[PDB]
Design a protein around this ligand. Structure first.
Ligand code: ZN
Ligand code: ZN
Ligand code: ZN
Lengths: 293, 78, 187, 102, 190
RNA sequence: UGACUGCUCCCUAGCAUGCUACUACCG
RNA sequence: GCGGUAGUAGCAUGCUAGGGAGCAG
């Protein structure tokens, strides 16, 4: 429930009703999220909606906080004060809030379909946590637009590595190589049953065997995906070079078969993070073992 | 004051043991329940302590379960 | 409640009427002033209580939502809370047998069954290093849980019997170390 | 009538549910428990009245904890209007005096 | 609340009267202003009150009818569930042994306690300890209720399979003892 | 998985009655 | 000059309905 909006540095219990990750936005922050774009629905500890039976109001800009509940516009007991008023949205942390100077971060990159280059452009023009939000939203959009294609299935089976394959109802098909593993499940009558891992490239349907299989009637193959949880630790560590070689277990011998190892050994002696830009044959083959010894 | 403390500790210990899915073994759960019910009815503070040792041995003889060392480094048990 | 237009109108009317009356005047002026004053006074007095009721109701609603959020949070950390509490009380008890077995388990010597209380019945522990064997087992007697036990069997990870005379400082490091001592409670 | 003090203390210390090991979430439990334990103050034995006094002090402590604990991280300011009645004996003395109310 | 039928007349009369007042005319026009505005507000009062009463009455009626509809839907679904349960449990009556013992009755009525005793296909036995076990279901086939049953499976209190080769006197204290034995009617029903 | 009764405290919503107050109509 | 009537506001009293909790057989 109680998460964290960090650009305004505001603990929050609110979240946007119709958005990517149910993102967390503080009172004023949810406000300029819902006036700079169209997101007229929010979620709190309880969802804001009129509580009389049979009533239906999606909007929040006209709801009222009644007798320990919420009531609305078309069906109006108005003995209350409005929920959305005075540059803020009613909730906890209604006083300890800051706001945002850059009004259109979400309004820019959380409002497009997460496929333009501008998303990554702004993600690189971000902070560590803002770009964390960016990366998690890229994984979310990857999965949410992967879950919009078909599920392959073998209903009558043929000889292995040459079968027949019908797919789904009306949906398109993704790219063709082994990038998408066709690892689905089998249904006997209501349950899911051991299937294995498959991949469809050649179609008469030629399959590549990640395992040896005895396919039965109806066997369905598709990637069923969960959603990546939020992460709690930073990606990169800030650059701080060491005072000395304190806390190391030094050795006496020096690597000789590797002709560019000793100075880099000393570097690891006082370097905290280390990235390089290299094709195959750049120490990835032997320098790791060099540090190991 | 040394008796109510051990009764409260026994209640907490039985709760912790129940949280670890111990009642999925009928014999162990029956023994634990018998020990816990016997501690609360005690009148002198030596039988309660030996039964407490016996009951704690059940939690200690479960390898994965909990981390004795981390739970001892948190300004907790010595 | 001095932040509403009704308050401003009522204050101006009050000041005007008070000044006119203190200056001294006739009856019709007083009547007109009070007929123009009382409506503004009622206008102020209604909101003066409506605002108070609204404010207290909002405070109560925020209180209730905080309570609900806190209860939902609390009912989701019970395992860790209970374990921490249990070990805190176990500290506070301060018993020698409990301390002995807790330290033994913390160093690696845990039992394999329920510790018996009778003058009989078997107890099995695991001794993973020579130092624990040095501390606990000396001679043919076993000290565990502030009691005394008598060794009768030693079994290794390969399940072969090892005689007591075999175990020694330099004579040990050629063995499967997770030994299993089976003893009975001495009288 | 007065109950057994052990029953009242056991009801205080042992609960079903986990959400009742946080007094601020339910202060109305202790008000009822102190209503049940009022007539113990006329008992010649001394701990029996101490039970009722302990309950009153715990109620006051819980209220103070709630107000401060809510004013601190949030900024909502609480008032103590007609709340002090719950830690004074006159609210509980009126339940055993013959005058029907409510 | 702003376009009521009397609102036009009230507002027009108020505007005209206040224009006459702003004209600075005699006191007679002021008295006429006061009387007309007083009666206008008096007539606007009930037109502003009765409408508000009626709206709340209508809202209450709507809410009550909605909840009635929901109750009817719930009744329909519970009826469907009960019918399904009855027709599902019907399909296991073993309609030849039951018919055979019903026809032997002199008027069609039989005690309920003897229907499972003479027509059931499966038997379940719960055994406290080994002494009781060796007197009731020893071996692989036993006799009970003037019939012959043969064992099919044995589980323990933890619902794990137990083989008859390890139910002995020496190995008794190593089992979760509330054992459950399942048998089939031999030569008769299953 | 949570039976039948009895009593009491707290919060909100509606109804009825009474007290006071402010304007207006009528005699 | 006094009373009646019509709205409006605050306060008090008893019931009905909803929710949370306590004790007893
Ligand atoms: Zn949004
Ligand atoms: Zn924000
Ligand atoms: Zn509504």
């Amino acid at each position: 429930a109680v998460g964290a909006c960090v650009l305004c540095n505001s603990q929050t219990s609110l979240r946007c009703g119709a958005c990517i990750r149910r993102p967390f936005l503080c009172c004023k922050c949810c406000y300029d999220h819902v006036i700079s774009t169209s997101h007229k629905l929010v979620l709190s500890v309880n969802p804001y909606v009129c509580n009389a039976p049979g009533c239906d109001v999606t909007d929040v800009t006209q709801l009222y906080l009644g007798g320990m509940s919420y009531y609305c516009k078309s069906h109006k007991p108005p003995i209350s004060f409005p929920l959305c008023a005075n540059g803020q949205v009613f909730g906890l942390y209604k006083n300890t809030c800051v706001g945002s100077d850059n009004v259109t971060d979400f309004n820019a990159i959380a409002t497009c379909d997460w496929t333009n280059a501008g998303d990554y452009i702004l993600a690189n023009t971000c902070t560590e946590r803002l770009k964390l939000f960016a990366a998690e939203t890229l994984k979310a959009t990857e999965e949410t637009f992967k879950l919009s294609y078909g599920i392959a299935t073998v209903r009558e089976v043929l000889s292995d590595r040459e079968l027949h394959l019908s797919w789904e109802v009306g949906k398109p098909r993704p790219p063709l190589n082994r990038n998408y593993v066709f690892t689905g499940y089998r249904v006997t009558k209501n349950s899911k049953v051991q299937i294995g891992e498959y991949t469809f490239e050649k179609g008469a349907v030629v399959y590549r065997g990640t395992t040896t299989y005895k396919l039965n009637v109806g066997d369905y193959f598709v990637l069923t995906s969960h959603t990546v949880m939020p992460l709690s630790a930073p990606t990169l560590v800030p650059q701080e070079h060491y005072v000395r070689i304190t806390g190391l277990y030094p050795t006496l011998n020096i690597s000789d078969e590797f002709s560019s190892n000793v100075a880099n050994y000393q570097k690891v002696g006082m370097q905290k993070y280390s990235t390089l830009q290299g094709p195959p044959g750049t120490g990835k083959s032997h320098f790791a073992i060099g540090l190991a010894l | 004051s040394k008796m109510s403390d051990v009764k409260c500790t026994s209640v907490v210990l039985l709760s912790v043991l129940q949280q670890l899915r111990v009642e999925s073994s009928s014999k162990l759960w029956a023994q634990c329940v018998q020990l816990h019910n016997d501690i609360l009815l005690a009148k002198d503070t030596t039988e309660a302590f030996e039964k407490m040792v016996s009951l704690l041995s059940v939690l200690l003889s479960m390898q994965g379960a909990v981390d004795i060392n981390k739970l001892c480094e948190e300004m907790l048990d010595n | 409640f001095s932040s509403l237009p009704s308050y401003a109108a009522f204050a101006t009317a009050q000041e005007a009427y008070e000044q006119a009356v203190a200056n001294g005047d006739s009856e019709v002026v007083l009547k007109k002033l009070k007929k123009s004053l009382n409506v503004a006074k009622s206008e102020f007095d209604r909101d003066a209580a409506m605002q108070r009721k609204l404010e207290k109701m909002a405070d109560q609603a925020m209180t209730q939502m905080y309570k609900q959020a806190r209860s939902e949070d609390k009912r989701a950390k019970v395992t860790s809370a209970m374990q921490t509490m249990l070990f805190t009380m176990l500290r506070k008890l301060d018993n020698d047998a409990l301390n002995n077995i807790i330290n033994n388990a913390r160093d690696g010597c845990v039992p394999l069954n329920i510790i018996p209380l009778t003058t009989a019945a078997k107890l099995m522990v695991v001794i993973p290093d020579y130092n624990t064997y040095k501390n606990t087992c000396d001679g043919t007697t076993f000290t565990y849980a502030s009691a005394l036990w008598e060794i009768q069997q030693v079994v290794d990870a390969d399940s072969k019997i090892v005689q007591l005379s075999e175990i020694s400082m330099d004579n040990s490091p050629n063995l499967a170390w997770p030994l299993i001592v089976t003893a009975l409670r001495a009288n | 009538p007065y109950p057994d003090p052990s029953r009242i203390l056991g009801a205080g210390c042992f609960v079903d549910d986990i959400v009742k090991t946080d007094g601020t979430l339910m202060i109305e439990r202790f008000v009822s428990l102190a209503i049940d334990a009022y007539p113990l103050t006329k008992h010649p034995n001394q701990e029996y009245a101490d039970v009722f006094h302990l309950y009153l002090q715990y109620i006051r402590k819980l209220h103070d904890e709630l107000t401060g604990h809510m004013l601190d991280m949030y900024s909502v300011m609480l008032t103590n209007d007609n709340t002090s009645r719950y830690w004074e004996p006159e609210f509980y003395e009126a339940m055993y005096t013959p005058h029907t109310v409510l």
